[PDB]
Amino acid sequence: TLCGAELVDALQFVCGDRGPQTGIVDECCFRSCDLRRLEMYCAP
Amino acid sequence: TLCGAELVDALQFVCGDRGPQTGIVDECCFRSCDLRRLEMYCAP
Amino acid sequence: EICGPGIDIRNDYQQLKRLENCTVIEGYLHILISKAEDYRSYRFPKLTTEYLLLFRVAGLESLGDLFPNLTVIRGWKLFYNYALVIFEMTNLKDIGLYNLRNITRGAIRIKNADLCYLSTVDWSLILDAVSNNYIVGNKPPKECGDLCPGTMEEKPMCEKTTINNEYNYCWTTNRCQKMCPSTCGKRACTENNECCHPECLGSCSAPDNDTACVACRHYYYAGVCVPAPPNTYRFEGWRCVDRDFCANILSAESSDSEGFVIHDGECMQECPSGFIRNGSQSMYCIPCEGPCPKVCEEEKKTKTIDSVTSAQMLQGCTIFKGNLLINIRRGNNIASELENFMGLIEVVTGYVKRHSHALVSLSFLKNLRLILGEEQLNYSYVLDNQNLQQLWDWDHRNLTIKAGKMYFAFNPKLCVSEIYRMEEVTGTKGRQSKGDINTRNNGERASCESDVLHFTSTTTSKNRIIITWHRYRPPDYRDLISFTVYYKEAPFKNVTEYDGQDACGSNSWNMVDVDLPPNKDVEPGILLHGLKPWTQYAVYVKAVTLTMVENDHIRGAKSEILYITNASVPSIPLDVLSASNSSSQLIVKWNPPSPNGNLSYYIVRWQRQPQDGYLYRHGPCCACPKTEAEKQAEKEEAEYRKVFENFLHNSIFVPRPEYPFFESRVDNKERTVISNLRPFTLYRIDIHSCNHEAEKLGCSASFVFARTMPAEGADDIPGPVTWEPRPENSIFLKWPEPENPNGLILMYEIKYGSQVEDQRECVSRQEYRKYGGAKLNRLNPGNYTARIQATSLSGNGSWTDPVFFYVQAK
Amino acid sequence: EICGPGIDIRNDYQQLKRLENCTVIEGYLHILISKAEDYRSYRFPKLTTEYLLLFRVAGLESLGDLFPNLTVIRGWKLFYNYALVIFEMTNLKDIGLYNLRNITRGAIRIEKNADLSTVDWSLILDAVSNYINKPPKECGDLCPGTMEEKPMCEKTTINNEYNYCWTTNRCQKMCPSTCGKRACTENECCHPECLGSCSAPDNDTACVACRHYYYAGVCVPACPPNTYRFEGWRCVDRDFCANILSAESSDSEGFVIHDGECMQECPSGFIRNGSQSMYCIPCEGPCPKVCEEEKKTKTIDSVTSAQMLQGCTIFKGNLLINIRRGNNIASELENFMGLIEVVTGYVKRHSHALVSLSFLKNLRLILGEEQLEGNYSYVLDNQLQQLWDWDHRNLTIKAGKMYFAFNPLCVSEIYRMEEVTGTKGRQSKGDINTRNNGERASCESDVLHFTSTTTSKNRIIITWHRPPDYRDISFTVYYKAPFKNVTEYDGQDACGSNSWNMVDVDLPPKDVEPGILLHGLKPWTQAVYVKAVTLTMVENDHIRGAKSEILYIRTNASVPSIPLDVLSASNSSSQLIVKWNPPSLPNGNLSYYIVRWQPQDGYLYRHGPCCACPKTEAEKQAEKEEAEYRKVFENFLHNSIFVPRPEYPFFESRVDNKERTVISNLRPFTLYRIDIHSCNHEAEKLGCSASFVFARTMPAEGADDIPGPVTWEPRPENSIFLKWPEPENPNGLILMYEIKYGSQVEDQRECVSRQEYRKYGGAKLNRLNPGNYTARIQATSLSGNGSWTDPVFFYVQAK
């Protein structure tokens, strides 16, 4: 489970500073997700 | 819904003077029952 | 420079540069640009129709120098119900948008870091129903410290206006918020307090001028604000352009259609609902019957339905380009799955063709009407498919293939009657060879010409059917063996035998069995047990027989669905309710009783329930006490407290495993009132749902009750109290009894005392009857006062008139 | 008059009369007798062996004159686990079971009542641990003795509760030092064989209840020869035990004597020899009950009818099967028709909801005492493949001729039973005819071999080599299988049950070989039986068909992939355990886990509980008017924003395989990017497992506190230049350096920045009074400040 404003700092960690309505707040938070698909929301 | 000590007064009232973890309390209280099957448990 | 459809500025502040070629966005604006490197180094004054998302842009404290001259968002489309959403932004301290006068379609959604200049902004003038806004969570108003020109500390500057009694001065600390005054109002406004063009909303490049309207209320066609021109179509944006522009755009993010088909006089991606594209041109559209859910076509032209998921991709659409080949071998009761999946589809530019036994008929396709047939396999065909039986309900859904050809061989349960004769219905008479729709194998199983058994006798019971039928006598009587009496709760003629057979045939007919007698004199007569309550019960007796010798030539047997509740009769009512609406009255209701029949009326049965002589002779923790999560010992208390009602409550008395009664026949209205009742008495109102044959087989299976509201007047004493002197400083009290005391005067309250009548007691009805009232004692010689109240069964009565009495020492 | 099999006193107080002829109830005694009419007007001293119900008995205030002489509720049988439950009784004010001495089996449950501490239930029931009631404050528990009367009843103490009694009318007594565990008598002892009580000291024939079985007027420990121990209190002769046929609690037509007792049934693995209660024959297959149903004949054409038999073994009739409607009901019948072990007749048609009768995995054999017309004890129109899994379950039909026609089920399944089941010629060759039987389905079907088993990252490109006629297409590559115990009919499609995941790709027209792609194969698993679906007609019965072998493409699934549920946790200072889980996606056989761990920047460097006291937030739905509104904001934000986007070195360690590990020799206090990498069988070949979790090493204390003391030095303007040494390897970073100082004690306190400190060589106090003073200094580490420095008793001067 990972959503809310904590999920915004969670995407800050997985993406670092490198750079149909169901989203990451409707999946990582809804069910459960690791720091692998959480950082799939980032660029290469 | 009808069980507890309230169903003891309920059964005796609808039982005129004719008056395991599953049975009659497991349907009148568990689901819902009227004053027709509640008194069906009663004698003549 | 006029912007193309939408903007998706992404990754870094360097993608803001794209706005340097966007004078009027004709779509949305999306800035996660949280680099904290730039701030106001990306100003685009040119920018002046959808969700303006300004969020997660570390380094952006205000848009005062990011999108200047933001005249008005046309709000053509919205993400939710807003054309500008600033959710908790990394660090936005003022919005900006110092030229935002209107959001036309929609509202805004601006909690936040240090964001201010929102209460001041007249949002009720930017949008109507400012209730759609949610600026309630935005960081406190004490922190706002609004210091926009005038409200800061210098002479008045920013507009002075109000929103629901919020009269204050603006967009940021260094910008104001203008709005339309009496000059124009609903019509746009301009500098020099001048009006805008008759047809204009937002701003005009020149005070009141057709060829100016920065935004334009409707369509700024070729630099002219038109309400709706030569070969030009109401463009979905802010400007307008000729038909060519539409027939030219093939895709552009918000843009998608190859040659934006024109209709509604609009240059829109597609036509509105109820018309197909005229050929492949943006000239107009073709009025049809809602062929517009969406262009069903998929990138992959060709398409099949070998899985329920393969079918679901085509769900919710009309014009597919390619085919709907059905290959679904397995799918438990997918009749309903495919009803929705392969259904809304109307046209297919290819065909609809193999090995499928999960759906018992192609009626799932309910909207499929014609098949363009653009592509071919070449068969535009059925082979090795069985369960399917009836194709596209040809009696309730004709279907043809603009370009077609049939083929039907090796298809056991699929009947040959769905094509041999229906070639006429599918306009395919000679689009193929007769050896294609051959007899060899084609229809070896199926229902075939199955005869129709007549129901010799059709008996009745309180809840049973004894349907019997002519002892079936097929080519050989040894071939025939058993019989099934399918049955289903169904009081509608709109029911067929393949509605719900067994798994592949779907599931609805409950099915049952009985063996046909070997004796030819004796005939078959099932004893269908327990028919379904308050429902007729359809009863089609199919001869589920075996096959041999003839095999495919076995005709079969299936008596028609004779919809036998005359075979049922009066039974127990349900959801009976009652509550005393008024004194000597008792309202009664009865949610349609759920009575093995068709209700005729509700016999009511009630009586003055006699009374015994026992009473005659007589979290937010602001104040949280106990919220222990250890109430499981209470469930342990209800362990045998519940299993004792599963204990002797089961097999002691076998559970069937003073006053007269009065009646009335409620026509059928699910309501009534028992008027002319005793002032206050309980009423066992036994609902009796008298059905069609209640006079013959008893009036239903008997309830609910209420106490008639206490008729005020009989509650209190029916008069005053009289006093008489008595010895020992005593005073004999006296009072009358009510005529019909509500239930009964349980106690006779008494009130007495000189200065105040604090001292109070109550006499028994018994003592009162023998005395006349009561007797007092030790009453200080001097003037005094008394009283009595009639404490009724329903509740206390009312004190009598003053009883100013007196006693003497001698 | 030993009552006989139990009592169910019901309806009225007039049923109590029957206890007149009840000396010992060899069963239960259930009392809804709501009638104040009578109360103690049904005294039966006679009654002196299972549960006793007491509830809804309006009028009963004490059983002192209802069941006097109650020796011991033997408690043999228990409704739940109690033998005297008095719950919600109409008006029982006293239990009044004065003689109650023991509860040999189970316990009781007296609890919340109308008007019902002294009784030592811990003596009757060894340790009361029962739900022992209506207000104990209202009890007023006072029997002669504990009241003004001098001590009458016996006394005992339990959990520190020394008291004197079942009721205030009679009292209580219990086995004293004389015996204790062994029964007892009025201060004399009981017989070796005797529990509860005896009517005379130490006597076989006096034994009131007997310790085991009171055989014909003598307490025997085991029943004499040609006699058997009635499970209750007495022992009876062989004739009585077997002649008894039924009586409510009694049911066995002759209680089949076994388990060293006249028991209704026998213990695990024992079946009544024919119809002889005398003994039981080792079954080896524990029997829940004789499975027979009142109805001699018995059919299973409904899934509910299958369930009606569930929970039993030896039926006395038959089990015809006719279930036409049913999908995957394989599991339904596995549970329902998978217990019957024997039947005295047969298992018979038209049932397309069964691929095989493997659901009956318990039916070991079939007797045949009852038969049909032409003694067919039969399959017709059932279009079944394997009968009773003959590979691993043989049966026998002692009396029954086979019959197999119109079942397009192999004829070989029954040609095997000719010898196996012993039906060599009970039936004719026309009964098990080949015409129509096994004309469809598939048996001879040739097993094709796999020509290539290419295996990418998540794609099996399985390929093969031609049916009887080449007019036959769709090559179902049915896939699914961590184990090698799988067939083809586990769950075909609808009629054949469902489990094998159907897939499909058409065979290309002679050059070009078929090559399906099971793209998206289960990561971490392999089965791939490539059956050939064809057109079965023209040759019809000569159409052989096909069924490729079930290879479990043994390439350890696919290859190395993202680990999962990793749980790194600093278990010690400069240490880091990396316990994880067998990932959800190792994609192989979990070979080892390369831990990979390594920017501490300098940003901080330069820097009802409480009754009446909280508030009512019961309006949590109104608090969710902005909380659920927060979730609406979530949709327009968490579906569209970064979707557009689609200092130190590293060190590694290949963990053997065990979930737990450790990462020692780390920095005093630093966060680590403790990545996990399940490098599997072919990681060197196909990449090493898609990479994590982070955790801060526990602070190695010593750098938390200041390593040395302080040097106070006099300075002008009444100043005092303090000093201190910098922690060598601080726990993360010494953000600030606290400084305590003051006259009497170190009253005041401040904190000098690490930067200012480095340039000052310490810190400077100011304007302190001329006279004795005291100081100290602390190191505010990233983990947390440690202890202060040694004492710094200083002194200042203005001149």
Q: Mark residue D341 as left, alpha or beta (left: phi above 0; alpha: psi -120 to 50; beta: remaining).
A: alpha
Do residue D57 and residue D194 come from a single domain? yes
* C264/C270 Cα distance (integer angstroms): 10
* C166/C176 Cα distance (integer angstroms): 16
CA D43 to chain centre: 48
* C745/C763 Cα distance (integer angstroms): 10
**Residues sharing a CB contact under 8 Å with residue D8, sequence separation 6 or more, in sequence order:** C651, C652, D30, D248
How many residues appear in chain C?
810
* A20/C549 Cα distance (integer angstroms): 58
Q: Which of C34, C111, C139, C294 to mutate to test the interface with A (most CBs of A within 10 A)?
A: C34
Provide the residue type at D453 as one letter: T
Picking from C745, C752, C803, the residue whose alpha carbon sits closest to that of residue C780 is: C752
Of D634, D635, D642, the CB nearest to A41: D642
Method of determination is cryo-EM
Asked if D88 lies within 8 A of B5 by C-beta distance, the reply is yes
Query: Containing domain of residue C38, as a range?
Result: 7-215
Pick the CATH number of A6-41 from 2.60.120.330, 1.10.100.10, 3.20.20.70, 3.40.50.620: 1.10.100.10
B43 interfacial to chain C (CB closer than 8 Å): yes
For C206, the token pair is: 């020149």
Do residue C278 and residue C313 come from a single domain? no
Query: Element (H or E) spanning C770, and its range?
Result: helix C765-771
First to last CA, chain D: 119
* D138/D668 Cα distance (integer angstroms): 66
Report CA Rg, chain C. Answer: 43
**Residues sharing a CB contact under 8 Å with residue C193, sequence separation 6 or more, in sequence order:** C181, C183
Taking residue B27's Cβ as centre, other Cβ atoms within 10 Å add up to 17
Are C643 and B20 contacting, i.e. CB atoms less than 8 angstroms apart?
Answer: yes
**Residues sharing a CB contact under 8 Å with residue C299, sequence separation 6 or more, in sequence order:** none
How do strand C408-409 and strand C382-383 relate by DSSP bridges?
parallel
Q: Which of D8, D12, D32, D77 to mutate to test the interface with B (most CBs of B within 10 A)?
A: D32
Taking residue C143's Cβ as centre, other Cβ atoms within 10 Å add up to 11
DSSP label of D738 = E
Query: CA distances (Å), C328 to each of C361, C588, D546, D793, in order?
Result: 12, 55, 21, 92
Are C565 and C598 contacting, i.e. CB atoms less than 8 angstroms apart?
Answer: yes
* A28/A24 Cα distance (integer angstroms): 5
Report helix, strand or coil for D546. strand
Taking residue C538's Cβ as centre, other Cβ atoms within 10 Å add up to 21
Picking from C262, C254, C256, the residue whose alpha carbon sits closest to that of residue C237 is: C254
* D363/D388 Cα distance (integer angstroms): 9
User: Residue C300, class by beta-carbon neighbours within 10 Å (0-12 exposed, 13-18 middle, 19+ buried)?
Assistant: exposed
Query: Element (H or E) spanning C639, and its range?
Result: helix C632-643
First to last CA, chain C: 119
Query: CA distances (Å), D134 to each of C289, C397, C470, D140, in order?
Result: 75, 74, 70, 12
DSSP string, C407-450: -EES-SSS-GGGTTTTTTTTT-TTSS-TTTB-SSSSSSSS-TT-
Report helix, strand or coil for D415. helix
Main-chain phi, psi angles of D514, to 5 degrees? -60, 135
Are D187 and D159 contacting, i.e. CB atoms less than 8 angstroms apart?
Answer: no
Query: Element (H or E) spanning C305, and its range?
Result: strand C304-305
For D613, the token pair is: 């006291």
Provide the residue type at C718 as one letter: P
Are C201 and C192 contacting, i.e. CB atoms less than 8 angstroms apart?
Answer: no
* D472/D533 Cα distance (integer angstroms): 8
Sign of CA dihedral D317, D320, D326, D330: positive
List the single residue in D with minimal CA-CA distance to C333: D327
* C724/C728 Cα distance (integer angstroms): 13
Do residue D277 and residue D425 come from a single domain? no
Domain at B1-44: CATH architecture = Orthogonal Bundle (1.10)
| d(CA D83, nearest CA chain C) in Å | 13
Picking from D624, D617, D623, the residue whose alpha carbon sits closest to that of residue C622 is: D617
Main-chain phi, psi angles of C70, to 5 degrees? -65, 80
Between the CA atoms of C452, C454, C460 and C466, what dihedral angle is there, to the nearest 10 degrees?
-70
Are D637 and D688 contacting, i.e. CB atoms less than 8 angstroms apart?
Answer: no
Are D83 and D107 contacting, i.e. CB atoms less than 8 angstroms apart?
Answer: yes
First to last CA, chain B: 25
Sign of CA dihedral C478, C479, C480, C482: positive
Are D493 and D452 contacting, i.e. CB atoms less than 8 angstroms apart?
Answer: no
Picking from D649, D92, D737, D618, the residue whose alpha carbon sits closest to that of residue C627 is: D618
How many residues appear in chain B?
44
CATH number of the domain residue C185 falls in: 3.80.20.20
First to last CA, chain A: 25
Asked if B25 lies within 8 A of C642 by C-beta distance, the reply is yes
Taking residue C38's Cβ as centre, other Cβ atoms within 10 Å add up to 16
Picking from A9, A33, D603, A32, the residue whose alpha carbon sits closest to that of residue C32 is: A9
Do residue D328 and residue D458 come from a single domain? no
Report helix, strand or coil for B10. helix
Kindly give the interhelix angle for C632-643 and B4-14, rounded to the nearest 10 degrees.
Answer: 20
* D446/C408 Cα distance (integer angstroms): 29
Between the CA atoms of C141, C142, C143 and C148, what dihedral angle is there, to the nearest 10 degrees?
70
List the single residue in C with minimal CA-CA distance to A42: C11
Report helix, strand or coil for D417. helix
Asked if A42 lies within 8 A of D642 by C-beta distance, the reply is yes
CATH number of the domain residue D217 falls in: 2.10.220.10
A32 interfacial to chain D (CB closer than 8 Å): no
* C69/C96 Cα distance (integer angstroms): 10
* C485/C541 Cα distance (integer angstroms): 4
Do residue D194 and residue D320 come from a single domain? no
* D382/D350 Cα distance (integer angstroms): 4
Picking from C64, C122, C72, the residue whose alpha carbon sits closest to that of residue C94 is: C64
* C118/C170 Cα distance (integer angstroms): 8
List the single residue in D with minimal CA-CA distance to B12: D34
Report the helix count and the strand count for chain C, using DSSP H and E: 8, 34
Q: Give the residues across from D738 on adjacent strands.
A: D751
Are D19 and D27 contacting, i.e. CB atoms less than 8 angstroms apart?
Answer: no
**Residues sharing a CB contact under 8 Å with residue D297, sequence separation 6 or more, in sequence order:** D317, D318, D320
Asked if C637 lies within 8 A of D131 by C-beta distance, the reply is yes
Picking from C549, C582, C773, the residue whose alpha carbon sits closest to that of residue C677 is: C582
Main-chain phi, psi angles of C534, to 5 degrees? 35, 45
Query: Element (H or E) spanning D626, and its range?
Result: helix D620-638
Domain ranges, ordered by start, for chain A: 6-41
Q: What is the 3-state secondary structure (H, E, C) of D466-520?
A: CCCCCCCCCCCCCECCCCCCCCCCCCCCHHHCCCCECCCCCCCCCCCCCECCCCC
* D279/D262 Cα distance (integer angstroms): 10
D635 interfacial to chain C (CB closer than 8 Å): yes
For C48, the token pair is: 């002046």
Main-chain phi, psi angles of D734, to 5 degrees? -85, 80
CA C251 to chain centre: 37
Angle, CA D199 vertex, CA D194 and CA D205 arms, to 5°: 60
| Exposure on the CB side of residue D326, measured as CA atoms within 13 A | 26
Report helix, strand or coil for D271. strand
Picking from D345, D355, D371, D352, the residue whose alpha carbon sits closest to that of residue D301 is: D352
Taking residue D492's Cβ as centre, other Cβ atoms within 10 Å add up to 21
Are C576 and C758 contacting, i.e. CB atoms less than 8 angstroms apart?
Answer: no
Query: Element (H or E) spanning D277, and its range?
Result: none
Report helix, strand or coil for C94. strand
Report the helix count and the strand count for chain D, using DSSP H and E: 8, 32
Between the CA atoms of D221, D225, D228 and D233, what dihedral angle is there, to the nearest 10 degrees?
-30
Main-chain phi, psi angles of D696, to 5 degrees? -95, 130
* C63/C40 Cα distance (integer angstroms): 7
* B11/C11 Cα distance (integer angstroms): 72
For D671, the token pair is: 């966060």
* D453/D461 Cα distance (integer angstroms): 6
Within 8 A of D646 by CB-CB distance, chain A residues are 43
Picking from D602, D605, D729, D604, the residue whose alpha carbon sits closest to that of residue D668 is: D729
Picking from C119, C104, C99, the residue whose alpha carbon sits closest to that of residue C74 is: C104
Angle, CA C151 vertex, CA C149 and CA C154 arms, to 5°: 65
Do residue C64 and residue C12 come from a single domain? yes
* C56/D496 Cα distance (integer angstroms): 56
Helices (H), D112-177: 121-124
Query: CA distances (Å), C422 to each of C397, C401, C428, D426, D752, in order?
Result: 12, 13, 9, 53, 97
For C100, the token pair is: 């935002």
Taking residue D127's Cβ as centre, other Cβ atoms within 10 Å add up to 11
Q: Give the residues across from D763 on adjacent strands.
A: D722
List chains touching B (3+ CB pairs under 8 A). Answer: C, D
DSSP string, D296-337: SS-EE-SHHHHHHH-S-SEESSB-EE---S-SSTHHHHHHSS
- Considering only the C-alpha atoms of chain B, give the largest distance between any 2 of them, rounded to a whole number of Å: 27
List the single residue in A with minimal CA-CA distance to D630: A4
Report helix, strand or coil for C515. strand
Of D564, D566, D638, the CB nearest to A25: D638
Q: Which of D633, D634, D638, D639 to mutate to test the interface with C (most CBs of C within 10 A)?
A: D633
Are C104 and C73 contacting, i.e. CB atoms less than 8 angstroms apart?
Answer: yes
* D607/C397 Cα distance (integer angstroms): 79
Picking from C490, C530, C493, the residue whose alpha carbon sits closest to that of residue C508 is: C490
DSSP string, A1-44: ---TTHHHHHHHHHHTT------STTTTTTS---TTTGGGGS--
Sign of CA dihedral C428, C433, C434, C439: negative
Are C197 and C219 contacting, i.e. CB atoms less than 8 angstroms apart?
Answer: no
Percentages helix, strand, coil for chain D (3-state, rounded to 5) are 10, 15, 75
Main-chain phi, psi angles of C621, to 5 degrees? -85, 5
How many residues appear in chain D?
799
D30 interfacial to chain C (CB closer than 8 Å): yes
Taking residue A31's Cβ as centre, other Cβ atoms within 10 Å add up to 9
List the single residue in B with minimal CA-CA distance to D90: B8
| d(CA C466, nearest CA chain B) in Å | 27
* D657/D592 Cα distance (integer angstroms): 5
Do residue D406 and residue D533 come from a single domain? no
Are C650 and B24 contacting, i.e. CB atoms less than 8 angstroms apart?
Answer: yes
